[PDB]
Design an enzyme around this catalytic site. Sequence first.
Site, PDB file in Angstrom:
ATOM      1  CG  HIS A 103      56.206  35.117 -12.661  1.00 35.77           C
ATOM      2  ND1 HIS A 103      56.084  33.751 -12.770  1.00 35.77           N
ATOM      3  CD2 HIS A 103      56.128  35.391 -11.339  1.00 35.77           C
ATOM      4  CE1 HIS A 103      55.962  33.219 -11.570  1.00 35.77           C
ATOM      5  NE2 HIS A 103      55.982  34.197 -10.680  1.00 35.77           N
ATOM      6  CG  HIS A 146      33.089  14.837 -29.273  1.00 34.74           C
ATOM      7  ND1 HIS A 146      32.721  14.615 -30.581  1.00 34.74           N
ATOM      8  CD2 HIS A 146      32.142  14.242 -28.513  1.00 34.74           C
ATOM      9  CE1 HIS A 146      31.580  13.947 -30.612  1.00 34.74           C
ATOM     10  NE2 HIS A 146      31.217  13.695 -29.369  1.00 34.74           N
ATOM     11  CB  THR A 203      36.419  14.915 -32.726  1.00 31.92           C
ATOM     12  OG1 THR A 203      35.402  14.128 -32.071  1.00 31.92           O
ATOM     13  CG2 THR A 203      37.606  15.099 -31.786  1.00 31.92           C
TER      14      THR A 203
HETATM   15 CU   LIG Z   1      55.926  32.652 -14.662  1.00 29.32          CU
HETATM   16 CU   LIG Z   2      32.211  10.164 -28.440  1.00 28.81          CU
END
Ligand SMILES: [Cu+2]
Ligand SMILES: [Cu+2]
Lengths: 328, 328, 328
Positions: free
Chosen positions: C83, C244, C269
């Site tokens: 990772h 929203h 929004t």
């Molecule tokens: Cu990862």
């Molecule tokens: Cu809405």
Amino acid sequence: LPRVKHTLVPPPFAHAHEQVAASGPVINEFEMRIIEKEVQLDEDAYLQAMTFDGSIPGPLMIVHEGDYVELTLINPPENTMPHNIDFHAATGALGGGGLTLINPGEKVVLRFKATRAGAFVYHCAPGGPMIPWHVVSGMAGCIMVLPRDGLKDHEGKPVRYDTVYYIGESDHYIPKDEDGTYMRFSDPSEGYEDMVAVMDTLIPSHIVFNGAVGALTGEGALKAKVGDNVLFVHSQPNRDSRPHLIGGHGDLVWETGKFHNAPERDLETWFIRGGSAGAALYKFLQPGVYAYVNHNLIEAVHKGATAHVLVEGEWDNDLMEQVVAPVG
Amino acid sequence: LPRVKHTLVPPPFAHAHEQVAASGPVINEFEMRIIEKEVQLDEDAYLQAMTFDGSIPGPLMIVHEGDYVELTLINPPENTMPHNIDFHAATGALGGGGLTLINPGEKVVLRFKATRAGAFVYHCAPGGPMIPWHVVSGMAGCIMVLPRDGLKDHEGKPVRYDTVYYIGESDHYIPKDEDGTYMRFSDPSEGYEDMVAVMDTLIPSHIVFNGAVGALTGEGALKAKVGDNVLFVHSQPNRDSRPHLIGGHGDLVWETGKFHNAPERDLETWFIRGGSAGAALYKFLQPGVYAYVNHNLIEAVHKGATAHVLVEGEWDNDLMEQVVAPVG
Amino acid sequence: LPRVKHTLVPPPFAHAHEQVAASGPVINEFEMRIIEKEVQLDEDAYLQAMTFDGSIPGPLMIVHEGDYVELTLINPPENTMPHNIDFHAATGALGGGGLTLINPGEKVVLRFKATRAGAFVYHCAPGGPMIPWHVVSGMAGCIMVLPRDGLKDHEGKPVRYDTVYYIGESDHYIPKDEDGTYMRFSDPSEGYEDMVAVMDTLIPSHIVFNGAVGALTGEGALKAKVGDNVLFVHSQPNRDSRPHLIGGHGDLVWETGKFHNAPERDLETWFIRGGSAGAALYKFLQPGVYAYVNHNLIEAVHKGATAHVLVEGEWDNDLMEQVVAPVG
Ligand SMILES: [Cu+2]
Ligand SMILES: [Cu+2]
Ligand SMILES: [Cu+2]
Ligand SMILES: [Cu+2]
Ligand SMILES: [Cu+2]
Ligand SMILES: [Cu+2]
Ligand SMILES: [Mg+2]
Ligand SMILES: [Mg+2]
Ligand SMILES: [Mg+2]
Ligand SMILES: [Mg+2]
Ligand SMILES: [Mg+2]
Ligand SMILES: [Mg+2]
Ligand SMILES: [Mg+2]
Ligand SMILES: [Mg+2]
Ligand SMILES: [Mg+2]
């Protein structure tokens, strides 16, 4: 406060109004009736629709910032479903949805203060899975709250339109047989489970302006003249759109739709976020045919998102000229 | 007016030009030939393509605001289809599409005035269902109309780039056999019905920069040096994109692509609306490899939307330092 | 420079901090442990997840512009995969990804200077096809770099929040059996090929806030009081979103998330580009329940993108009033 009773007109047109408020705050009275009916989207494609006032989109309401809006909403006894209304223009109770749930045979009156200028979506939102379903069956429109002194540009200069057109864009999710043909149902509830399965793919079968493929083309084409400043108010209650006027531009564009923000200039294509309305002003400079489209061209052409504007006036060769005609 | 004849260069490069116009308005002369050819998108994926000048995207044109553009467009007799051109930079006749329809064996010359500054899409649009199909087969490029006095920042200060790269992003809809493998055709028309069915799902099989998966990586990687101000002009004629330079930022970004609007600063990721071009300037501060990607990482990695930029210069530990190397 | 050691708190909450920096630049020390675990997205839907610090999203880090960030990242020996971490806030080495690749049993310490103010995504990006896969398995969070003098509005006026909530929105691609039910796997690698096939369609099975359907509803509902200025920081590392607040607005919105740009006002929004974080401030004016949603309502309701905010205080009939209760 004075009360003003409005007669709504169907989209893409707008009820009589003034851009600069001729008075101080008023209470604006509107009435709409919910109509459940099957509608033809396309040649062999039908939608078990649910509508505000019989149109997709619902009709455009126009008021000024600081006015009140008093809406009478009526759900006739012949309807099958409970319905309500959420104004994105409004503050509280889920836009009014929490105060407007009405069963077939009932009516309700909601008042709200239009405290914020801009074009806003309104839509039905009766709760849970009903929310997306009622919207994608057609239950959404737009309210435009103009600044009391009319629109202003990026420099605070007054701006005026000759014409507003309300373009309501709507995505629909009509279920299909294995061979690609569209299914028909007796009523909305019968078609529900099949519609959900299409909704889950997030791929609309149709994406239309004014409730049907070709509604704003041919006989429904929009009209203007060279010199006209036309405001195109564009709503999409559920899915993004990217409006483009083919042959033109957005002279002033509020793509997020809220008029106290400075508009952008000279746009080729703008962006309507799903769940919002935006607005674009253009002054026509050349005659001829224009197409106003969602510029995912598959959505424009295969799904239905194309309007035409027919413009009369004199051609300007300084802007554009065919120097050598197709030849060979 | 003076006439200036330009030799176009293939993307991602740009023909010779000056950022600040060395003269008053000129008539800019360009010529392009339409080439229909099968192109390899990926290892076992081919596209029955239709191109401006043999490249996807079509080559970048650069002019100044108030200039004229005179384009000679040629459709050689070996082609199978009629073609035309719609400049989003232009006013009238569907961007020029209404004046440029040419059959195989014909040529046409269009003039327009480049009245608005910004990066704009140009694309083929021969009419009806042909419109999306020609575009998704590769027929789109970009014209950049610079302000006569060069680019300015959000405060009106002059801004200058060392290098422009034109990144043409294109979505394609290659039909598949039941086992997931891609189909091959003899010509565009043969593949049409199968392609439409893919287009209808709105799911591209490939989304590429410069016409192919990996075109701008490995041997095609872009190059720069620490200190270079690089303008990335990014077009997407049909579908949205969200460009991101991994390891960098957008110092000044015009995501809607129109240069008289104030750019935004310090962006991580910006948004190119389908049917538009945008532009981002970045000054490189660290050497090493960068990836310029559409930041839907599935679109970046599985679909093909990744370019690399290789940057030479000295590392700055004040900006970033590995304090403890991987250890354990 | 002073060193400040922070204790991270799980989303949607934020670790202790001050909006206006109480000091000059500091070195901010954070530590996170990568946890690979199966997580329940929904009633019969599980994800072979990979997480920063055991949460989806990863926890919010808050620092000031010009500070340093020193992160200790730990990949415990029980994990199966390598990772790393890419901070979009950082300059160089692919956001730090090039300097942080760690195998199970290793740890690494990265320092970067937080030179740019704004909310930024951080995510795992171990290379090639691993990139989208690790992100859509849950490996992304957000770092907010506040201006040293706190937030300012479109006019440069100081703005202050009472509460920040970090809403991490994540799309997931859980494979299905032919009957629509979701598949289960022993570990991430086992589910990989099946997940890729779903990723290729670009249709998420689930789109969630805080790692699960309903995580921020019921017992997890957000809370506020009338009068509270609440900052909603919203990340989407892979796919677009359109937040929203149902019943409210965005008073000040930085949808691109970078605080030196002027915010827009009065939005219904807004738009979070995939691969970015944005921020919206709202002052609550009415009590009751609000829904904070991705306003593609299918994504909100069918996919999982809905949070609730429960607000206490006194109702204001001037803003909204039920004039005639449902009657008939
Ligand atoms: Cu990862
Ligand atoms: Cu809405
Ligand atoms: Cu309804
Ligand atoms: Cu063509
Ligand atoms: Cu176009
Ligand atoms: Cu990233
Ligand atoms: Mg009536
Ligand atoms: Mg049938
Ligand atoms: Mg029947
Ligand atoms: Mg040539
Ligand atoms: Mg095969
Ligand atoms: Mg054959
Ligand atoms: Mg810890
Ligand atoms: Mg099963
Ligand atoms: Mg098993």
